[PDB]
Design a protein around this motif. Sequence first.
Motif, PDB file in Angstrom:
ATOM      1  N   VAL A   1       0.808  -1.209   0.000  1.00 54.41           N
ATOM      2  CA  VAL A   1       0.000   0.000   0.000  1.00 54.41           C
ATOM      3  C   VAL A   1       0.850   1.272   0.000  1.00 54.41           C
ATOM      4  O   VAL A   1       0.531   2.241  -0.688  1.00 54.41           O
TER       5      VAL A   1
ATOM      6  N   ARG B   1       2.168   2.110  -3.402  1.00 54.91           N
ATOM      7  CA  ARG B   1       1.050   2.551  -4.230  1.00 54.91           C
ATOM      8  C   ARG B   1       0.656   3.998  -3.935  1.00 54.91           C
ATOM      9  O   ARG B   1       0.482   4.801  -4.851  1.00 54.91           O
TER      10      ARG B   1
ATOM     11  N   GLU C   1      -0.808 -18.210  -5.083  1.00 53.37           N
ATOM     12  CA  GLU C   1      -1.440 -17.153  -4.294  1.00 53.37           C
ATOM     13  C   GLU C   1      -0.567 -15.901  -4.245  1.00 53.37           C
ATOM     14  O   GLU C   1      -1.083 -14.783  -4.209  1.00 53.37           O
TER      15      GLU C   1
ATOM     16  N   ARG D   1      -2.303  -8.660  -8.876  1.00 53.75           N
ATOM     17  CA  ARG D   1      -3.315  -7.736  -8.363  1.00 53.75           C
ATOM     18  C   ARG D   1      -2.728  -6.345  -8.154  1.00 53.75           C
ATOM     19  O   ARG D   1      -3.358  -5.352  -8.492  1.00 53.75           O
TER      20      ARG D   1
ATOM     21  N   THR E   1      -2.311  -4.621 -11.616  1.00 58.39           N
ATOM     22  CA  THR E   1      -3.604  -4.269 -12.194  1.00 58.39           C
ATOM     23  C   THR E   1      -4.183  -3.044 -11.483  1.00 58.39           C
ATOM     24  O   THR E   1      -4.758  -2.159 -12.116  1.00 58.39           O
ATOM     25  N   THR E   2      -3.982  -2.972 -10.171  1.00 60.63           N
ATOM     26  CA  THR E   2      -4.481  -1.849  -9.382  1.00 60.63           C
ATOM     27  C   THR E   2      -3.706  -0.570  -9.672  1.00 60.63           C
ATOM     28  O   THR E   2      -4.296   0.485  -9.904  1.00 60.63           O
TER      29      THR E   2
ATOM     30  N   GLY F   1      -3.968   0.034 -13.723  1.00 59.74           N
ATOM     31  CA  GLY F   1      -5.309   0.005 -14.273  1.00 59.74           C
ATOM     32  C   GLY F   1      -6.337   0.819 -13.508  1.00 59.74           C
ATOM     33  O   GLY F   1      -7.332   1.265 -14.089  1.00 59.74           O
ATOM     34  N   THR F   2      -6.107   1.005 -12.209  1.00 53.76           N
ATOM     35  CA  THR F   2      -7.046   1.733 -11.361  1.00 53.76           C
ATOM     36  C   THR F   2      -6.504   3.098 -10.951  1.00 53.76           C
ATOM     37  O   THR F   2      -7.084   4.133 -11.289  1.00 53.76           O
TER      38      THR F   2
ATOM     39  N   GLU G   1      -7.565   6.615 -12.530  1.00 52.18           N
ATOM     40  CA  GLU G   1      -8.399   7.491 -11.713  1.00 52.18           C
ATOM     41  C   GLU G   1      -7.823   8.902 -11.635  1.00 52.18           C
ATOM     42  O   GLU G   1      -8.565   9.881 -11.684  1.00 52.18           O
TER      43      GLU G   1
ATOM     44  N   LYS H   1      -3.789   2.919  10.918  1.00 52.54           N
ATOM     45  CA  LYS H   1      -3.068   1.858  11.620  1.00 52.54           C
ATOM     46  C   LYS H   1      -3.129   2.069  13.132  1.00 52.54           C
ATOM     47  O   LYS H   1      -2.941   3.182  13.617  1.00 52.54           O
TER      48      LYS H   1
ATOM     49  N   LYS I   1      -5.394  -2.348  11.129  1.00 49.09           N
ATOM     50  CA  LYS I   1      -5.851  -1.152  10.435  1.00 49.09           C
ATOM     51  C   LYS I   1      -7.361  -1.029  10.600  1.00 49.09           C
ATOM     52  O   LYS I   1      -8.097  -1.980  10.331  1.00 49.09           O
TER      53      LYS I   1
ATOM     54  N   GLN J   1     -14.490 -12.002  -3.770  1.00 44.82           N
ATOM     55  CA  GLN J   1     -13.084 -12.294  -3.478  1.00 44.82           C
ATOM     56  C   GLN J   1     -12.924 -13.383  -2.411  1.00 44.82           C
ATOM     57  O   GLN J   1     -12.087 -14.282  -2.568  1.00 44.82           O
TER      58      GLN J   1
ATOM     59  N   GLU K   1     -11.186 -17.050  -2.717  1.00 49.01           N
ATOM     60  CA  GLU K   1     -10.034 -17.416  -1.911  1.00 49.01           C
ATOM     61  C   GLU K   1     -10.309 -18.526  -0.909  1.00 49.01           C
ATOM     62  O   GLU K   1      -9.395 -19.268  -0.557  1.00 49.01           O
TER      63      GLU K   1
ATOM     64  N   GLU L   1      -9.032 -13.420 -13.128  1.00 50.53           N
ATOM     65  CA  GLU L   1      -8.748 -12.539 -12.004  1.00 50.53           C
ATOM     66  C   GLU L   1      -8.602 -11.091 -12.463  1.00 50.53           C
ATOM     67  O   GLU L   1      -9.035 -10.162 -11.779  1.00 50.53           O
ATOM     68  N   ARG L   2      -8.004 -10.910 -13.635  1.00 51.80           N
ATOM     69  CA  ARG L   2      -7.859  -9.581 -14.204  1.00 51.80           C
ATOM     70  C   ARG L   2      -9.239  -8.995 -14.479  1.00 51.80           C
ATOM     71  O   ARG L   2      -9.491  -7.823 -14.197  1.00 51.80           O
TER      72      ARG L   2
ATOM     73  N   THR M   1     -10.788  -7.907 -11.039  1.00 50.51           N
ATOM     74  CA  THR M   1     -10.080  -6.777 -10.466  1.00 50.51           C
ATOM     75  C   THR M   1     -10.411  -5.504 -11.227  1.00 50.51           C
ATOM     76  O   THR M   1     -10.501  -4.429 -10.640  1.00 50.51           O
ATOM     77  N   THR M   2     -10.606  -5.628 -12.533  1.00 48.67           N
ATOM     78  CA  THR M   2     -10.956  -4.469 -13.344  1.00 48.67           C
ATOM     79  C   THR M   2     -12.392  -4.027 -13.049  1.00 48.67           C
ATOM     80  O   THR M   2     -12.650  -2.842 -12.858  1.00 48.67           O
TER      81      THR M   2
ATOM     82  N   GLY N   1     -12.575  -3.261  -9.082  1.00 45.37           N
ATOM     83  CA  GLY N   1     -11.540  -2.374  -8.580  1.00 45.37           C
ATOM     84  C   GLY N   1     -11.386  -1.102  -9.396  1.00 45.37           C
ATOM     85  O   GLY N   1     -10.988  -0.064  -8.860  1.00 45.37           O
ATOM     86  N   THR N   2     -11.713  -1.170 -10.683  1.00 48.12           N
ATOM     87  CA  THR N   2     -11.549  -0.018 -11.559  1.00 48.12           C
ATOM     88  C   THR N   2     -12.882   0.588 -12.000  1.00 48.12           C
ATOM     89  O   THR N   2     -13.151   1.770 -11.746  1.00 48.12           O
TER      90      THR N   2
ATOM     91  N   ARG O   1     -15.361   1.701  -9.179  1.00 49.57           N
ATOM     92  CA  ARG O   1     -14.686   2.763  -8.431  1.00 49.57           C
ATOM     93  C   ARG O   1     -14.655   4.082  -9.208  1.00 49.57           C
ATOM     94  O   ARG O   1     -14.848   5.162  -8.638  1.00 49.57           O
TER      95      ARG O   1
ATOM     96  N   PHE P   1      -9.071  -4.705  -2.007  1.00 50.16           N
ATOM     97  CA  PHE P   1      -8.010  -5.265  -2.847  1.00 50.16           C
ATOM     98  C   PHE P   1      -6.592  -4.915  -2.368  1.00 50.16           C
ATOM     99  O   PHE P   1      -5.614  -5.185  -3.072  1.00 50.16           O
ATOM    100  N   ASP P   2      -6.465  -4.367  -1.161  1.00 51.48           N
ATOM    101  CA  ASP P   2      -5.133  -4.127  -0.604  1.00 51.48           C
ATOM    102  C   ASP P   2      -4.449  -5.458  -0.353  1.00 51.48           C
ATOM    103  O   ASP P   2      -3.258  -5.626  -0.630  1.00 51.48           O
ATOM    104  N   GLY P   3      -5.219  -6.413   0.160  1.00 49.08           N
ATOM    105  CA  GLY P   3      -4.715  -7.753   0.388  1.00 49.08           C
ATOM    106  C   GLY P   3      -5.821  -8.788   0.359  1.00 49.08           C
ATOM    107  O   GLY P   3      -6.835  -8.606  -0.314  1.00 49.08           O
ATOM    108  N   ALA P   4      -5.638  -9.862   1.120  1.00 48.90           N
ATOM    109  CA  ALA P   4      -6.626 -10.928   1.180  1.00 48.90           C
ATOM    110  C   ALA P   4      -7.939 -10.410   1.742  1.00 48.90           C
ATOM    111  O   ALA P   4      -7.987  -9.363   2.392  1.00 48.90           O
TER     112      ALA P   4
END
Lengths: 859, 859
Positions: free
Chosen positions: A416, A419, A468, A475, A478-479, A482-483, A487, B324, B329, B449, B453, B474-475, B478-479, B482-483, B486, B507-510
């Motif tokens: 993060v 990013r 994984e 990911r 792509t973020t 692509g995002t 944006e 945090k 978080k 998601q 998973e 997955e792409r 995410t698009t 996530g895109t 958004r 989409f920061d992580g799991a």
Amino acid sequence: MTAVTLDGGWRVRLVPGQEQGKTYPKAAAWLPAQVPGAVQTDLIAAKIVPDPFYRDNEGKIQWAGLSDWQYQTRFTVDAATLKREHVELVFDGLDTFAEVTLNGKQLLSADNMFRQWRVDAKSLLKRGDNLLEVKLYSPIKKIQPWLAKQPYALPGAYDSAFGDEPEARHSSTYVRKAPYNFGWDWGPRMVNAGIWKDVRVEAWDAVRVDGLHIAQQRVDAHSAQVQAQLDLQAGRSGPVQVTLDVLGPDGQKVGQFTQDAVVDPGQNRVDLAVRIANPKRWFPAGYGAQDRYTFVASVRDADGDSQQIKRVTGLRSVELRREKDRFGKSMEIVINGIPIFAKGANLIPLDAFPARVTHERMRSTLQDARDANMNMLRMWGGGHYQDDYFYDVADELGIMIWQDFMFGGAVPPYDVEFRENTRQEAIEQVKRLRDHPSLVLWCGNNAVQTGWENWGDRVKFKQSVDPEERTRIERGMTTLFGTVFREVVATYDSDVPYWATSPGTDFDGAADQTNDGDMHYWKVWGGPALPVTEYLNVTPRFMSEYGLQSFPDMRTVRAFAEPGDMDPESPVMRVHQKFDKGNGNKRLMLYIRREFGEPKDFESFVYLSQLMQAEGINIAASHLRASRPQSMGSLYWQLNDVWPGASWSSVDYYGRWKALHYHARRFYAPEMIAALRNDKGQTEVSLVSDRTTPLTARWRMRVMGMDGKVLSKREEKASVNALSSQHVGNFSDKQLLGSADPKRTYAVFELLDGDTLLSREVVFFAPAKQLALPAAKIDSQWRADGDGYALTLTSDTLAREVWLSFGDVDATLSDNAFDLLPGEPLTVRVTSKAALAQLQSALQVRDLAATLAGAPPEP
Amino acid sequence: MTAVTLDGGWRVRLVPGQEQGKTYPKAAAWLPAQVPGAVQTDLIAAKIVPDPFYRDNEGKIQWAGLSDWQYQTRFTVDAATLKREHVELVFDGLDTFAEVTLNGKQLLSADNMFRQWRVDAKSLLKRGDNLLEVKLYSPIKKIQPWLAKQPYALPGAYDSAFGDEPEARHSSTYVRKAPYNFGWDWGPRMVNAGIWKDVRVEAWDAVRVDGLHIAQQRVDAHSAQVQAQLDLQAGRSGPVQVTLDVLGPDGQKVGQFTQDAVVDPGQNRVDLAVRIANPKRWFPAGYGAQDRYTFVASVRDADGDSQQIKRVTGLRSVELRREKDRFGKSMEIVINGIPIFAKGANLIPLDAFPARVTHERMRSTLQDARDANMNMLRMWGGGHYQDDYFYDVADELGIMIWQDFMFGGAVPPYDVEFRENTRQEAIEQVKRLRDHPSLVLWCGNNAVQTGWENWGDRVKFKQSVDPEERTRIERGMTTLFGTVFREVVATYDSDVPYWATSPGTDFDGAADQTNDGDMHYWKVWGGPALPVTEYLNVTPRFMSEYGLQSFPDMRTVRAFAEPGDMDPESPVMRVHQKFDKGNGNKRLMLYIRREFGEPKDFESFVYLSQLMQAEGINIAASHLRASRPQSMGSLYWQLNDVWPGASWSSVDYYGRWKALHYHARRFYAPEMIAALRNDKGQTEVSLVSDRTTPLTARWRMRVMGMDGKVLSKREEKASVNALSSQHVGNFSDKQLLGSADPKRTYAVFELLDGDTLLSREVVFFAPAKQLALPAAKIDSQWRADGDGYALTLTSDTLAREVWLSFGDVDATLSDNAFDLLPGEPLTVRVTSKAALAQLQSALQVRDLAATLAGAPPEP
Ligand SMILES: OC[C@H]1O[C@@H](O)[C@@H](O)[C@@H](O)[C@@H]1O
Ligand SMILES: OC[C@H]1O[C@@H](O)[C@@H](O)[C@@H](O)[C@@H]1O
Ligand SMILES: OC[C@H]1O[C@@H](O)[C@@H](O)[C@@H](O)[C@@H]1O
Ligand SMILES: OC[C@H]1O[C@@H](O)[C@@H](O)[C@@H](O)[C@@H]1O
Ligand SMILES: OC[C@H]1O[C@@H](O)[C@@H](O)[C@@H](O)[C@@H]1O
């Protein structure tokens, strides 16, 4: 509102306690520092290290990129500026890991070469003398100890040729810093550290003007609807009055607009709607005028104080048209409703040390492009976002900018923090550059996706981690590409398109395809190193990268090398050949020998390298243009150089044109005839016109023996539609030659408008080394022509690729690397500041036949 | 500007030539059709199929979801509306694959249940009578033949319990249609086909108002800066004058604003900046008033025609704070600078047939939420975007809406066409819903998601396909999540946050983590089916899903079942139990038996199912609130029902409260005492306060024998900070009981403000089935209280979970499912339309001890 620049008494030294402190005691002590600048260039000026561009001096400065540095300067602050309600220090550029203190106190931590850092400093400032300190940390030394502990290192860029970083474990990936600083296959490794942009003390009371943006809502021939957006930071609530003056391209006033408002603490936007009837729109070069309007906003704050801000902008609609057809899905840039076939090249930094680049060099680079009939440069993502002045000239000359964000191909980390650091960079760069009409496209990165899908090291890497983990990394990309970048563009510059990656299909599918999106084609030169005629077999919807390597001008060669170095295999020349880990000369000679055999001496080697490159790119560029509407883009790699040495450029580091650039002006000509012969003995002839009107033309075809005899002559009328390519010919060798000796015959193709010759191509039927070219005698005649001179060349026979030069005497030529037809005089204009007498003595005239004569056999 | 609605003479039939036309001849012939509606409900009204909600009638209507249907209507258009420069047909909702014809000619193709379809119809409209025809195609019938040819089918939703789709090959994934229409684990399979929203003929001349958006740029106590954005479609260039009147919550004038402009052919934006000093902001329920301003824009075009559009909006800042801290978080909704602990539930459609939902049911659903002290509902992505009126009531009542886009968990296809279809759906919904202050968050989907998973079938699928195909899929996700979604929110409703997926970390992580983002916790009820005390061991930053199942009200059970059906294992009851493919009664009985053993009769089974659910959710919600700031959200699954049957709801299909909803009022109370005993015999006591001021409180703890004798009593002072939870106790069983029998002892916890009792919790030390609860005698006294009645209950001993009911006589109660302490009277208000005499006759008073008495052993 005051803004004084801290560009004076800076000095710099090694941070105490490093081993470089023992090796270079003069660097341990304070030495003069230039801001903006680099410690590298400071060391050079101080004679601590020699010029790293000269011969093999590159390695002698690598230690600076591995060390930590301490900047210091003192400055005084008035009682008047301390009065002010806000006093801030502003850093336009810190490269890269910076720790700034003021009077010993913590001030700022920075970690992005491409960000601007603003910080409240009023409480830390003393009346009068202040001590500002900046410590810059080697990105290699900072990251590598961490990286050595990671389960894996991300696929990156280039290995260090000095072994100061482990193989395939590059720190450059993890830091927002110009990728080319770590070394690339046409440039040195200069991991710069420096305060590489201005530093200011800024002070204000009620309001600070943060920006003016002319947001183009809709632009066409009938009208332009725009919105003048004014960003205002306020410390307290109060009235403001905004006046907006609009001046047309002619300088006359278009209108005045006013807006009253009340601002509140924090950020405020004041919008003024402006509609311009029948606007004089901005067009790219070759499609009209580069008309620009001037918007002048003055802001009266609550105290009655007036601040003024100005934007010069060009009214233009931009569309990235992607429509399905017989060739798949198109990719074409449409400016003001006009489909523009992109003609240009890829733009890299102008120097290994970007802070020292002059305005004159910025302008001549773009002027070079304009002169070769280009309409677009792609600012490649491995470099740095350019200076404001550069974009101004691009606006002025009508050179469209394909603007990559500065990611050069490395696989980014997915954390993060990285990013969000990158997001803020993207926001500030887009805010800075958006009002430049020449900026017509934003692109996420260079080659990241196509590398992930096709490059062996990437393919092996992504299959070595757990699936994984692969998903996490994919990911992240792509973020980010692509995002996040998308944006930022959609929010702050919404009238221009975004493109996730070059080459690619905007993440719709796979990258580097022939029937969707753009392509980087490198199976010529790179990979299997196919012959140049293979260019005729590759036709993507848009070609954003392709190229061939060559040496720079002999004057440039003599600039970095001594006479004893003049050999492609010499240690000095090998240093300046960066392709394939120093073994690039093997690949260069591969292509040279195929066409010209073995060069007989070094000057011939350089000349033949440039011919190989020029003729090769001519094939591809002409073919791409002739294939319209299948293809709609040609950007060759590359335009320019960061350093004297071997590269794919058409203009070298000192601004000197290679044979390729002179050829580029021809194959990028608005009206062009393409006569391309494939490896099956078929020559396809096309008439290309970028006119927006019909071209009523004549085209000629003459087949000549090299003893001067005419075999055949033919002339036809042709009506070429606007913005199109028309195939008028496809001749087999037999249809052109008819039992005549291909080693002794050639063909001349010409395009005419009335009595005006617009374009010419001379076609051959065997590699040059096999041809029986005549021994030309080329007469040269001079005459005074203004403040320059007119040089007229007349050859009795055919003369191939005539190259004019003047030793170490500097002069510029209106044309070079041209073919001379028997008895047909060509007059070129010579611009120099030397007298006629020395130009005549210094004149050197080289041609292909003469060069190939007396050549040794290939190994 | 005219807009006539085609809401009259519709009829419908099977498209000729289907096998269903022979099986159901009455459906082959024309039958009355209701618009808005569904062919399903039209068939019911026509007595062609029985009510699918009744007993086991569900299967008898499945054929309608497999068939193609033909709507038809005739309408007249006067010469006056034909005058207009533009005449359009507008379809607000077509479910789903639609082919529209007008007077025999093709007019429109539609393929999205959630889009509005506008089409120029002027050239096709006739003098007088017009024939409009609409054909709807079964999504199952259309997609399956294509799907059967595919290399794979994407992981979807629920299998058909009727075998009319192959296992693990669901068509529902590939079509933009409400996921729950295909059946869910709390609802029937009603694959609706219908014109399920209005159809209009619209006509206009110079300008059409496409929308008004009040864009809130910055909102705080000092001021609100907004921009009234007006979208205008124009047919020709011309002047316009815009007037904006602003009215406050009191209806009085705030200000009038004016703006002249010239519109051009196409789309035009007119922005009017408005600043409101000291705004009366909109707060969610429990945190202030739901103040709303009224913005009225009128537009006078070049023809002099005036059009008017109106928006009611609440001035509100929304922040999704993720900072945090010690627990990782955070994830918290911050409204007007106030961190709001989200208290509520998940909202699903109000009916299997969405078009027949009345306004009263929409309103009473939100009122239910408000009454149980909720401040947020999540509109879950497996349903449909709600009616405009629904969001209006939410604005009014201050119920925040977490708005999912309508993706329910299926893995979407990655084709461009699906993406762009969905993009337009998102644009239209965000444009429609944005000005509602209650809409504070947008979410990409439900569980896509975390399913990808953590769900076995997804994991197996993604590892079965080629890794490059996995990357493609997955792409695609995410698009889209996530895109695309958004960008739409960032573009059209930019002051509210977006969330890629629930549960997740954007989409920061799991997904579904405990120290970042939100969580759907289902290891209780689902999966390993852990005991409810496991809720005390799970503490995410935000809990957006969790729950326990129960039966609806006895009146609701009698509504869909006959006396011979009254057994959980009967065919009818299994039909109405949709969890785990009809075998859900085992999971329900597992949890019931754990606490209460074996129910002695059906009515006891229903009651105990509701107690099990109520007490279980009470544990978790109390735990979550008491854990603040570790957790900041509690949205239990679920709030409501689509149909009479078993579910996780707290309110059944007919609006009847379960024990859970009454319990919910208590554990979501603004001030609450939490006394939670874990599986290790430790009772932690916390005081929770949602006040924005400090609470100077008193809390009590009394340990009681079941014979009425007091074992111990304690009172302590506590100062509870604003917006916090404070732990004031943690007692072992030994410290509380001290050799006393846990089966014969209980504890009473109370939170007080002065002499005012704010909250109470009664704690037990063994499962209810092991307790020796006293045989209570409960005195009931009536008295007239306006048009209702005051019912006072007094128990001599402890009476647990007293449940009041009146057979099939309808009445509403101010409180129910409560505990009665010895000699302590409780008065509830009874609202009914029956006379007192019948209420007294029908009154039934049930308590836990009586219900557990005489129970048979577990199998
Ligand atoms: O040591 C420097 C490195 O520190 C770690 O925390 C990484 O997350 C990065 O921030 C950086 O590359
Ligand atoms: O790899 C092919 C070419 O790709 C370009 O993007 C640059 O990185 C060049 O230096 C390189 O030679
Ligand atoms: O025909 C049914 C389906 O067939 C294929 O084309 C899918 O890609 C969908 O677009 C379509 O709905
Ligand atoms: O996972 C397979 C299917 O069965 C259960 O797991 C539910 O979660 C469904 O939503 C899912 O589609
Ligand atoms: O998967 C567990 C639960 O998840 C929710 O999102 C809904 O789909 C419920 O119907 C389901 O029971």
